[PDB]
């Protein structure tokens, strides 16, 4: 019963704050150019102890053949997909907390569930973008981001499962 609400909320704040922290730092920890870490925006050294704007997607030594550097490198730049996960998750918790009251038996829970799982898809796809463009160790809050996507996925499972539960109540009492 209410276990759906519990797992739902703890998934919301869990994967949400976890995605935010993932945006914070600890996304890639390795030797810099000398070792440092970076979170896809700016790297911070151990001179040492300071930071520098590191998401310089263009670098002044290349060839840039045809839509490879521009399109892909730009896509990885500004971290669009993970921000898409941010907005979509925001709609997740917001629309579930909306599903608290204002019954609307069928449409809402299913909707937020859909945009929520697909939000997870945006998260994983974004991770793919990041690991891709980066071409040695990873940051820990990176694992926090992936784990956030996972817990999100399970939360969506419980979501849709609760939705078809409501369908079972309605069609059940229908006879």
């Amino acid at each position: 019963r209410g276990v759906q609400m519990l797992l739902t909320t703890v998934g919301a704040f869990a994967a949400f704050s976890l995605m935010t922290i993932a945006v914070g730092t600890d996304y890639w920890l390795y030797s810099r150019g000398v070792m440092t870490h970076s979170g896809l925006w700016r790297t911070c050294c151990l001179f040492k102890g300071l930071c520098k704007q590191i998401d310089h997607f263009p670098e002044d030594a290349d060839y840039e053949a045809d839509t490879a550097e521009y399109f892909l490198r730009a896509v990885r730049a500004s971290s669009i997909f993970p921000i898409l996960s941010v907005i979509l998750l925001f709609m997740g918790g917001l629309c579930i907390a909306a599903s608290e009251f204002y019954k609307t038996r069928h449409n809402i829970i299913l909707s937020a569930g859909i945009f929520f799982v697909s939000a997870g898809l945006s998260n994983i796809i974004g991770i793919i973008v990041y690991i891709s463009a980066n071409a040695y160790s990873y940051g820990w809050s990176f694992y926090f981001g992936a784990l956030s996507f996972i817990i999100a996925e399970m939360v969506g499972v419980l979501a849709v499962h609760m939705f078809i539960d409501r369908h079972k109540q309605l069609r059940a009492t229908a006879r």
Partner: protein, 50 residues
């Protein structure tokens, strides 16, 4: 005497002497090398046909 990588032409013969040519060559075109390109999505289907 000129002992050097000098190109031999008519007008240069028109003023001085050259021995028999010892090393043959042609005009050459030089460019910058690009980096080894990465295929991308194409690797899904690239081989075996067009």
């Amino acid at each position: 005497i000129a002992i050097a990588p000098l190109t031999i032409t008519l007008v240069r013969e028109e003023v001085i002497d050259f021995s028999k040519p010892f090393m043959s060559l042609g005009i050459s075109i030089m460019i910058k090398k690009p980096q080894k390109s990465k295929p991308g999505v194409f690797s899904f289907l690239d081989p075996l046909a067009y």
